[PDB]
Write a protein that binds this ligand. Structure first.
Ligand SMILES: Nc1ncnc2c1ncn2[C@@H]1O[C@H](C[C@@H](N)CC[C@H](N)C(=O)O)[C@@H](O)[C@H]1O
Length: 326
């Protein structure tokens, strides 16, 4: 669909009656280091992407009884769970994370994150982009729209997290590599990835039920979790609703991620360990995933100003989303 101006997109923001709504208050404000054992996380694994990593099609568990790939899938599953058993018993891969909840309000396309409930001093701003093509029957979405506008005077909140399958991932993979054991190098990396993603799923449930606490009686099966049958989202920088990777630096500062977990950011703002997930938490019932997609020069320049960056800098970080030749 054809581009619209930045002002036209903002005039089509998510429509919601904030005066009639009470955002749920975060029960546990502040930052908390967390850990999770392999025994705990293995009940939150989504196995279907594991089999995709091994080039097998089909959803788990039905893939195990498949007529052509089932026997191979069963052997992969057995080797995977034997390796989880060993990693668990030997404590050689140790998932870690950190979670935080903060007072927050929307201003424009950004989310102000406050030091405290006086909502004066801003400790960080979470910057977001807005869809910028002609939308029929939908808002031009921006993740900031899911937090109450500061002008509404409603007390709202935002969360953030960072989790990893464990800092030991490289040492375990590198040992298999030195042995020319490609199978087990792929296996331990695929397991660390499942453990990181399982930790993201588990911690999000902890946030909905307890840390934020807006869904204390939620009782979903793992299959229902995989289907996202809960209220709220956990969008991650680099994914289509928030594609701009340098916002991971804001999460790293907000949560003191490196101090609490050992996890690091590269110059490309990739996470280390490789098996890592970081992102935000939104509680709003209408919050959903979508793609920002292609944006125009006016929004690039505005984003640069808000970020304290030059236009040239931002055109690097936003290159995949530029709707024009830079
Ligand atoms: N459009 C989007 N914008 C932002 N984050 C997204 C988007 N789509 C997916 N995500 C993120 O990706 C997650 C979904 C999956 N990657 C992870 C769970 C899945 N069961 C798996 O193991 O692959 C979401 O919970 C978000 O953190």
């Amino acid at each position: 669909t054809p581009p619209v101006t930045l002002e036209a997109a903002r005039d089509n923001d998510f429509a919601f009656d904030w005066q009639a709504y009470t955002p749920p208050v975060a029960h546990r404000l502040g930052v908390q280091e967390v850990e999770a054992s392999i025994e705990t996380l293995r009940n939150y694994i989504d196995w279907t992407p594991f089999f995709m990593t091994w080039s097998l099609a089909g959803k788990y568990p039905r893939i195990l009884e498949d007529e052509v790939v089932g026997v191979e899938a069963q052997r992969l599953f057995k080797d995977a769970n034997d390796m989880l058993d060993k990693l668990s018993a030997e404590k050689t891969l140790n998932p870690r994370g950190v979670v935080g909840l903060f007072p927050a309000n929307r201003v424009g396309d950004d989310i102000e994150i406050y030091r405290d409930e006086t909502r004066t001093h801003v400790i960080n701003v979470s910057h977001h982009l807005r869809q910028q093509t002609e939308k029929t029957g939908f808002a031009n979405y921006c993740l900031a729209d899911f937090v109450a506008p500061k002008l509404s005077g409603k007390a709202d909140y935002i969360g953030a997290f960072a989790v990893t399958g464990g800092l030991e991932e490289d040492a375990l993979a590198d040992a298999f590599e030195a042995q020319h054991d490609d199978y087990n190098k792929i296996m331990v990396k695929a397991l660390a990835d499942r453990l990181a993603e399982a930790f993201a799923e588990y911690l999000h449930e902890r946030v909905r039920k307890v840390y934020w606490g807006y869904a204390p009686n939620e009782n979903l099966s793992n299959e229902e979790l995989i289907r996202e049958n809960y209220q709220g989202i956990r969008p991650a920088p680099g994914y289509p609703a928030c594609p701009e990777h340098t916002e991971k630096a804001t999460i790293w500062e907000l949560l003191e991620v490196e101090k609490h977990t050992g996890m690091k950011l590269t110059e490309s703002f990739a996470m280390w360990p490789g098996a890592s997930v970081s992102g935000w938490y939104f509680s709003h019932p209408d919050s959903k995933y979508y793609a920002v997609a292609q944006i125009q020069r006016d929004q690039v320049e505005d984003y640069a100003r808000r970020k304290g960056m030059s236009v040239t800098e931002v055109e690097r970080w936003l290159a995949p989303n530029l709707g024009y030749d830079a």
